[PDB]
């Protein structure tokens, strides 16, 4: 399952309402009830990454409210309410059913 | 509605768990369906049974039960210590349109996530 | 729960290496321990996982030749093996854990090669 | 927790209605806490009751929905048919929090599956 994403790099500096988009090669409505199986990770260049959003719309505990995620059947996106001082580094996307598969970059 | 595998998502206390359960036939004696989770041991798996009756009013019944296993010393095969039960029943009538039944089902489904129920069940404290 | 890996390693040519993940504070009853790797710089790849409730011997494609996952239940330590070293011994490998089908909860620091 | 106004969203077949209900006291005889909706008529009332017991702990929830029809040759309305519901939990003394939470969440999520909606909305055996 290939997980295509936005181009490699952006150049947003400050204040901009930057959004990150992603596309899937197969519908992610695996669960019987209508629940998606995506998750967004961010990784600083130094240490291991962290988890930000799971189920494509639920924020993880200990995350500022500036992050917001919305999802659809096969076209997902990640929008942040403006960029703060420390919101840089690579952002990853993952599906975690059957065979997990990452893919993409910033 | 033919029986098939059901995958529930976003469950648990923290909201990250999930379970997959698959059909296990229908009992001809009383016409009750069955489902269970592939737990590698027939006696330590969560199971669900759903059945709808016929008339002078209809009746839908759902039962949920799941055991907890503990391997006490002096033995090798695990046994069951305690079990948690559940029960749901509906009593619609003949002249009831699908709108009312759907309203009742949605009301019951959304009433199990309000703070009142999640406080009265998880902590077992009576409402006052 | 928190887990940490065990030390950078430096190997030459093609031999066998020992990578271990020390996990403390959780039980293997339902969780699955993944072995994601990042290679170098950009992108990251999956390897496999060990879960007692799903078989515990599931490997990513084209990695069965160069992977072997074994777990010691008494010491709660999971260590994986490598057989051939041509380009696999390139950069950092990670160690992760999580629920049966849920996301990856917490990771430890990765050893570099 | 003490009783308070409870509002429910995305209720209905199409997921657009909204049900708001407020407390209606506590019965001291057997300790059931009631709820009700301000429908301006006590008889045509949607009511919900919840109560827990003390020792094998038992939790019970009942839902009642009356349907009003304009009686022929009369002024005041009368109830024709009623729709019932019931939930019962039977945890034990040594049961932890996680087991009860798992049971409750499983019951909540399973009730939105296509199997249950087919078995309830259309009343066809599985």
Complete DSSP assignment for C57-110:
-EE-TT-STT-EEEEETTTTEEEEEE---SSSTTS-B--EEE-SSS-EEEE-PP
Q: Is A67 on the interface with C (CB under 8 A)?
A: no
Q: Is C100 on the interface with B (CB under 8 A)?
A: yes
**Considering only alpha carbons, which residue of chain D is nearest residue A32?**
D113
Sketch out chain A's domains with CATH numbers: 19-95 (2.60.40.10)
CA angle, residues A87, A89, A91, in degrees to nearest 5: 95
- What tokens appear for D1 in the block? 């927790």
Check CB contact under 8 Å for B1 and D124: yes
Long-range pairs, A25-31, Cβ under 8 A, ≥24: A25/A1, A26/A1, A26/A74, A27/A73, A27/A74, A28/A73, A28/A74, A28/A95, A28/A97, A29/A73, A30/A97, A30/B7, A30/B9, A31/B7, A31/B8, A31/B9, A31/B10, A31/B18
Query: How close A66 comes to chain C (CA, Å)?
Result: 21
CA distances from C26 to C107, D29, D51 (A): 13, 47, 36
Chains C and B touch (3+ CB pairs under 8 A): yes
- Of D7, C72, C71, D89, nearest to B121 by C-alpha is D89
* Residues in chain C within 8 Å Cβ distance of B39: 53
Domain membership of residue C56 (yes or no) is yes
Q: Spell B77-96 as b/e; 16+ CB within 10 A means b.
A: eeeeeeebbbbbebebbeeb
CA distances from C89 to A24, A43, C24, C67 (A): 31, 22, 27, 12
CA dihedral over D99, C103, C50, A100, signed as positive or negative? positive
Q: What topology does CATH give the domain B6-96? A: MS2 Viral Coat Protein (3.30.380)
Check CB contact under 8 Å for B18 and C102: yes
Rounded CA-CA distance D33/B119 in Å is: 14
* Residues in chain A within 8 Å Cβ distance of C98: 96
What is the H or E stretch that residue A22 is in?
Answer: strand A19-23
Domain membership of residue C8 (yes or no) is no
Rounded CA-CA distance C58/D44 in Å is: 59
C9 in helix, strand or coil?
coil
The residues that bridge with A51 in the sheet, in sequence order, are A41
* All partners of chain A with 3 or more CB pairs under 8 angstroms: B, C, D
Q: Is A55 on the interface with B (CB under 8 A)?
A: yes
- What tokens appear for B70 in the block? 């503990």
| CATH of region D6-95 | 3.30.380.10
Rounded CA-CA distance A51/A67 in Å is: 12
* Residues in chain C within 8 Å Cβ distance of A5: none
What is the H or E stretch that residue A68 is in?
Answer: strand A67-70
Q: Which of D:106-125 have CB within 8 Å of A?
A: 109, 112-115
- Of B123, B112, B54, nearest to B86 by C-alpha is B112
Q: Spell D66-75 as b/e; 16+ CB within 10 A means b.
A: beeeeeeeee
Q: Which of C53, C101, C105 sits opposite B18 (nearest CB)?
A: C101
Check CB contact under 8 Å for A33 and B18: no
Query: How close B9 comes to chain A (CA, Å)?
Result: 6
Pairing of strands B60-70, B47-52: antiparallel
- What tokens appear for C56 in the block? 């515990």
* Residues in chain C within 8 Å Cβ distance of B40: 53
- Of A65, A69, A14, nearest to A41 by C-alpha is A69
Query: How close B70 comes to chain D (CA, Å)?
Result: 13
Report helix, strand and coil shares of chain B as percent, to nearest 5.
15, 40, 45
Rounded CA-CA distance A45/C75 in Å is: 32
Domain membership of residue C1 (yes or no) is no
Complete DSSP assignment for D46-96:
-EEEEEE------EEEEEEEEEEE--TT-SS-EEEEEEEEEEEE---TT--
Rounded CA-CA distance A30/C102 in Å is: 13
- Of B34, B11, B12, nearest to B21 by C-alpha is B34
Residue B87 has phi, psi (to 5 degrees) of -160, 135
The answer to whether A57 and A48 have CB atoms below 8 angstroms apart is: no
The answer to whether A4 and A105 have CB atoms below 8 angstroms apart is: no
Domain boundaries, chain D: 6-95
Q: In what order do the strands lie in the sheet with C68-72?
A: C2-5, C17-24, C77-82, C68-72
Complete DSSP assignment for B55-89:
-----EEEEEEEEEEE--TT-SS-EEEEEEEEEEE
If one counts every other C-beta atom within 10 angstroms of the C-beta of residue C104, the result is 21
**Residue C27's domain spans which residues?**
16-100
The answer to whether B120 and D50 have CB atoms below 8 angstroms apart is: yes
Domain membership of residue C80 (yes or no) is yes
Domain CATH number, residue C59: 2.60.40.10
Rounded CA-CA distance D25/D2 in Å is: 11
If one counts every other C-beta atom within 10 angstroms of the C-beta of residue D5, the result is 9
In angstroms, how far is CA D104 from the centroid of its own chain? 15
Domain membership of residue C5 (yes or no) is no
DSSP code at position D32: P
- Of A77, B58, C92, nearest to D121 by C-alpha is B58
């Amino acid at each position: 399952i290939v997980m295509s994403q936005s181009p490699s790099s952006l150049a947003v500096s400050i204040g901009e309402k930057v959004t990150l988009t992603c596309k899937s090669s197969q519908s992610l409505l695996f669960s019987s009830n209508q629940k998606n199986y995506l998750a967004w990770y961010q990784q600083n260049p130094g240490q291991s990454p962290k988890l930000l959003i799971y189920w494509a719309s639920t924020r993880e505990s200990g995350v500022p409210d500036r992050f917001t995620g919305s999802g659809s059947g096969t076209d997902f996106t990640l929008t942040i309410s403006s960029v703060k001082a420390e919101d840089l580094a690579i952002y990853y996307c993952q599906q975690y059913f059957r065979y997990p598969a990452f893919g993409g970059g910033t | 509605a033919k029986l098939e595998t059901v995958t529930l998502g976003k469950i648990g206390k923290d909201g990250k768990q999930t379970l997959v359960l698959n059909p296990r036939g229908v009992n001809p004696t009383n016409g009750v369906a069955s489902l269970s989770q592939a737990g590698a041991v027939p006696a330590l798996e969560k199971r669900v049974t759903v059945s709808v009756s016929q008339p002078k009013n209809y009746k839908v019944q759902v039962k949920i039960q799941n055991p907890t296993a503990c391997t006490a010393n002096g033995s090798c095969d695990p046994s069951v210590t305690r079990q948690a039960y559940a029960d749901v029943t509906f009593s619609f009538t003949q002249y009831s349109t699908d709108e009312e039944r759907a309203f009742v089902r949605t009301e019951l489904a959304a009433l199990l996530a309000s703070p009142l129920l999640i406080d009265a069940i998880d902590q077992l404290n009576p409402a006052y | 729960v928190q887990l940490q890996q065990s030390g950078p390693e430096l190997v030459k040519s093609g031999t066998s290496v020992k990578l271990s993940c020390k996990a403390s504070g959780y039980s293997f009853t339902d969780h699955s321990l993944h072995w994601v790797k990042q290679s170098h710089g950009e992108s990251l790849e999956w390897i496999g996982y060990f879960s007692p409730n799903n078989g515990g011997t599931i490997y990513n494609q084209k990695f069965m030749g160069k992977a072997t996952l074994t777990v010691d239940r008494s010491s709660s330590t999971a260590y994986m093996d490598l057989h051939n070293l041509t380009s696999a011994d390139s950069a950092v490998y990670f160690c992760s854990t999580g629920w049966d089908y849920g996301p990856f909860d917490s990771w430890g620091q990765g050893t570099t090669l």
